[PDB]
Design a protein around this ligand. Sequence first.
Ligand SMILES: [Y+3]
Lengths: 132, 11
Amino acid sequence: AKPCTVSTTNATVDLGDLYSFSLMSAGAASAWHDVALELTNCPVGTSRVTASFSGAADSTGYYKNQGTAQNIQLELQDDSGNTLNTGATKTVQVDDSSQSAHFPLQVRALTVNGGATQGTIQAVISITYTYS
Amino acid sequence: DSTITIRGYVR
Ligand SMILES: [Y+3]
């Protein structure tokens, strides 16, 4: 099927400042941050959009922090609570009333082993779309 | 097609 038009070329998630005392215990994390991927001008005949997520992951399985902060990972989930680690895919239905598709996602920082250290948090997740 | 950039700091 023909591809829709990518509306969300860039999406920035600013976690802001997180303190080490709130990231000391294993499993501790930051608050959830809304992130949406939107497609438009979907051609007639194209009813499904599949997003493929890809990014550098560390030994924990989550997205590796390319920043200086140690013992910190990044997690991407859909609005249903399902984790979308690197290699994961998600399929949504196209809205034929507006010819668009949307991917309501959530992003947060977390420390799997706890003991997060001072430093920066940086990570980039690439998304590629397939249509049917 | 899309890029999600995550940024922040740990104090
Ligand atoms: Y949400």
